[PDB]
Amino acid sequence: RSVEDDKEGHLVCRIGDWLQERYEIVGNLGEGTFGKVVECLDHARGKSQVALKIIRNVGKYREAARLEINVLKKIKEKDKENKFLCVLMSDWFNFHGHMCIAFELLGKNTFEFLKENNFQPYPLPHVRHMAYQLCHALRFLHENQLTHTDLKPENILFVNSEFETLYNEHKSCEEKSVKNTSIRVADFGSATFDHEHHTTIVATRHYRPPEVILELGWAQPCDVWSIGCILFEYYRGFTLFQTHENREHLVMMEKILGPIPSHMIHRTRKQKYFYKGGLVWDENSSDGRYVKENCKPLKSYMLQDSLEHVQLFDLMRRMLEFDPAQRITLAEALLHPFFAGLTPEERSFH
Ligand SMILES: Nc1nc(Nc2ccc(S(N)(=O)=O)cc2)nn1C(=S)Nc1c(F)cccc1F
Ligand SMILES: [Cl-]
Ligand SMILES: [Cl-]
Ligand SMILES: [Cl-]
């Protein structure tokens, strides 16, 4: 059987196809610039269901995937009972130049669920449970000297994304409400140990913290900022920072969170963003006018005034502190009174 690649180096495969006389493809899960993700049955392990990430036959992707595999091995080694909520690898192999990584099959990611729910946001009890698990998952990675650097809703999966369809009487429309809010953290390809080389830029732009934009260096607090942006997005169903460029991003940060601390401004070599100790930007530009119209103080985005909403917003604001040294740690976050509302099942991790 000839193995075939398309023009971009993606493996040509379809439902029905097999790999290593072992993994039978039974579905398509998704795709990206890295290649594709298929659902397989693993005939060597009782037909167990797997998500198999199939990387393009392109050197720079094969190399990144090899690094991801190495990261995953180290993580598994530190969490042998798979207790700390990560999507860990069951197998990996090089298939005619395509690196393939097999993972236990979970449900949809939290972005895809949001999207299939027409971007209607998660209810607060759901946001609260998800935030709790995220703080705990990352706290454990952080305590093992690791930073994720690429947290975003697409990288957070429901263990099971089965939902109930409920009629929202205030909206005159149906809503999908996930039956179980247990989640797992995925995509460790960019994860960086304390002692390893730190690239100047990390994170997906919408989830990238100011110390990274200002090239001030970064560590574990990077992940805390990203979690704050994620929690906003779960709660409102739209992205906190919908931006494509650094200068606009910083202006959004200022409108939503207040001024950038002067000490950060004085320390950055990125002085092109500043003029006279202050952000410089064209208020009359397409980006200028978009930000002035759409970006408001964080507190203004609260849907309700009850105590649990106030506590969410207090927590989010502490996650979104400009100075990574002042930013709440996840150890501290887990002590926040926002988490008093967890059911005992949610708190003990069921
Ligand atoms: N372990 C695992 N299970 C799943 N399941 C899944 C994926 C997509 C969908 S879909 N097609 O969006 O409804 C449903 C279930 N995905 N998955 C993984 S590791 N996805 C994944 C990811 F979440 C981030 C980067 C690469 C990936 F391959
Ligand atoms: Cl490319
Ligand atoms: Cl191995
Ligand atoms: Cl200005």
Author numbering: 134 to 483
From the article:
There is a growing recognition of the importance of protein kinases in the control of alternative splicing. The serine residues in these sequence patches are phosphorylated by several protein kinase families, most notably the serine/arginine-rich protein kinases (SRPKs) and the CDC2-like kinase family (CLKs) (Colwill et al., 1996; Gui et al., 1994). The phosphorylation status of SR proteins regulates in turn their cellular localization and activity. CLKs regulate alternative splicing by phosphorylating SR proteins, thereby modulating their cellular localization and splicing activity (Prasad et al., 1999; Tardos et al., 2008; Bourgeois et al., 2004; Eisenreich et al., 2008).
Interestingly, superimposition with the triazole diamine cocrystal structure revealed one Cl atom in the same position as the primary amine nitrogen that forms a hydrogen bond with the hinge backbone. In contrast, superimposition of the two CLK3 complexes, with KH-CB19 and CDK1/2 inhibitor, revealed the preference for CLK3 to adopt a more open conformation with the P loop moving away from the ATP binding site. Therefore, the markedly decreased affinity of KH-CB19 for CLK3 may reflect the energetic penalty associated with its induced fit.
